[PDB]
Design a protein around this ligand. Structure first.
Ligand SMILES: Nc1ncnc2c1ncn2[C@@H]1O[C@H](COP(=O)(O)OP(=O)(O)NP(=O)(O)O)[C@@H](O)[C@H]1O
Length: 254
């Protein structure tokens, strides 16, 4: 059976799908990671060293942007790995990159405000859910922050890559939003770092564990958990497991 993949280059290259439009490509000992219609964001991710660096780009006759990247050799990070200095430093580099911020803006991205976000929580809802949305409305007064930055928004450990060359990368940048840094820092510390270590983690990151941070973080991790159960209402398997994860999260925040 033919594989619908003849937009290409060189017949001496193995090509097969590998998230998104991801195909690998092999010839001699050179592997590439190829993507169809990637965002102009990718150029800045490569220049900043966040993802494996670009190798070439070709604009198709239709106008498809085909990009080749170094194919990284290594492994995903395990949850045990998420407390290392390198994870905190790379996340700090994303959160302070004015060049990444500049691209997202040029691409027409809304600064993401907890106001409009809490409104989007339209869920249909168990009793624990009702008390959850209470906590979010009765703390909106304290979840403000003026300096919005690039956030990746799915900082799950499987999106972190580690190379045999001692390079660390963070990938999958479709949910990139302009938002409060807490929107990433919260889910990361809550899920993978024991709270006696939070202040030392944030010191590697380069941020003091202030009291607006404790509230902002708890707000968005709770907000994240509720918007995830919401999603499984369209499925019915991980919906009954998220609730148990929300139950524990609720206990930690009074
Ligand atoms: N430039 C890249 N962008 C995104 N993901 C990449 C990139 N390069 C590699 N990957 C991912 O990294 C993994 C490939 O690393 P690799 O070490 O070859 O895989 P492995 O399963 O750990 N070992 P192997 O089974 O022998 O191929 C896959 O998850 C790829 O999707």
């Amino acid at each position: 059976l033919n594989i619908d993949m003849n937009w290409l280059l060189g017949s001496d290259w193995e090509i097969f799908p590998a998230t998104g439009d991801a195909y690998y490509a092999k010839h001699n000992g050179q592997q590439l990671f190829l993507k169809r219609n990637s965002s102009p964001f990718l150029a800045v991710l490569s220049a900043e060293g966040i993802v494996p660096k670009l190798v070439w780009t070709k604009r198709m006759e239709n106008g498809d942007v085909i990009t080749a990247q170094h194919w990284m050799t290594g492994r995903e990070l395990k949850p045990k790995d998420m407390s290392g200095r390198p994870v905190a430093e790379l996340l700090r580099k994303i959160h302070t990159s004015k060049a990444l911020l500049d691209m997202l803006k040029r691409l027409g991205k809304e600064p993401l405000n907890p106001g409009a976000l809490l409104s989007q929580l339209k869920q249909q809802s168990s009793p624990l859910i009702q008390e959850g949305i209470k906590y979010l409305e009765e703390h909106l007064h304290e979840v403000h922050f003026g300096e919005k930055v690039v956030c990746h928004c799915d900082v799950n450990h499987n999106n972190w890559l580690l190379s045999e060359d001692n390079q660390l990368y963070l990938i999958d940048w479709d949910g990139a939003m302009i938002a409060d840094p807490a929107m990433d820092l919260g889910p990361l510390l809550y899920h993978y770092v024991e709270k006696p270590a939070w202040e030392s983690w944030l010191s590697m990151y380069g941020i003091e564990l202030t009291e607006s941070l404790r509230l902002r973080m708890a707000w968005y991790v709770l907000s994240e958990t509720i918007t995830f159960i919401a999603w499984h209402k369209a499925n019915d398997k991980e919906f009954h497991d998220a609730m148990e994860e929300l139950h524990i999260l609720m206990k930690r925040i009074v």
